[PDB]
Amino acid sequence: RKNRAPKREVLADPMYNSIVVTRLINRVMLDGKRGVAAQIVYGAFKQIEEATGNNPLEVFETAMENIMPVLEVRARRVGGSNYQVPVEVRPERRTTLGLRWLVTIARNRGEHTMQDRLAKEILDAANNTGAAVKKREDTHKMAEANRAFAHF
Amino acid sequence: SKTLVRKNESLDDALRRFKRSVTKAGTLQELRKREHYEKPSVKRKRKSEAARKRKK
């Protein structure tokens, strides 16, 4: 629409000190089940607490590096000549898309509990390989085809 | 005749020499309009109010 109509803001964590704790609640939390959502998030820094026992931001922020790409895409046409001319949006939206990525693979895995397949992707996020880095290189390799800007 | 080179030109300086001066070469309008051949009554659509629109 026309304007920069305002967004909303949730508060950052005092427990493990990240706003993406409660934004991780903003993607795992479905049907407004915020207490179960915090049970999964606090249970996931508990998944850090068995595996490494370190700060949440090691696995959580290396995970953020895995799931925050550089580039995203856009449809831009001449009259049908859809040059996929790209953009590189800011870390609130990039972090938001990475939250879609961790809710994606840390949701849709046929394992035992939400903290068990989210133990597969928060613990494999502690293994910091595979699906996330490919889940951004799937757009990163396209940029050479996205070399055109407004040329023809 | 052709010096091809502005006075101690640099890369972007010769780029501005060829952009500016070779834009005032006229080296492109007759070519792009000479993409295709036209009827000679269209050659005087060329020789019409385009040039009169340029001056007057």
Binding site: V78, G79, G80, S81 | -
Partner: protein, 159 residues
């Protein structure tokens, strides 16, 4: 194609000219890609056919377009209105296929007529400038009256 909904909504249904409906929408199935749904919805009344209403709606997989149009004969409404569907697809060729369609202003004195140098006392008072942009009528050329800071009639004058 996929599905119909044949509906004679005032008179009973008879599948000779309804089959003719089925064959001209057979020519919709000459101009089809996925004939997703149609619906016949027709209406004829009393008083020796002072109308002939017919309808078929067209939810195709991307576009939807209905047709509740008339003639005197219902047979002529099937004729001219399904031919209207043919010419509608003739309108829907390019509407379907051709998804490509292919500081100081560098200027002169803004005033027009020349004013003499005594009028520059009024010309400075004319528009509200301390100088007076006026081609001098008394003096041969251009003259202007400034405002000296002592408080008297000034003169911005090459003179």
């Amino acid at each position: 194609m996929i599905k119909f909904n044949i509906r004679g909504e005032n008179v009973e249904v008879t599948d000779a000219i309804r089959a003719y409906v089925e064959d001209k929408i057979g020519k919709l199935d000459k101009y089809f890609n996925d004939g997703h749904e149609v619906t016949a919805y027709v209406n004829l009344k009393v008083y020796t056919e002072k109308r002939a209403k017919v309808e078929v709606t067209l939810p195709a997989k991307n576009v939807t377009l209905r047709a509740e149009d008339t003639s005197q004969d219902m047979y002529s409404s099937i004729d001219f209105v399904e031919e209207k569907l043919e010419r509608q697809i003739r309108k829907y060729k390019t509407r379907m296929n051709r998804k490509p369609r292919n500081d100081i202003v560098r200027t002169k004195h803004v005033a027009l007529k020349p004013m003499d140098a005594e009028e520059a006392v009024l010309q400075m008072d004319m528009l509200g400038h301390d100088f007076y942009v006026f081609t001098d009528a008394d003096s041969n050329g251009t003259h202007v009256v400034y405002r000296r800071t002592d408080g008297r009639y000034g003169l911005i004058e090459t003179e």
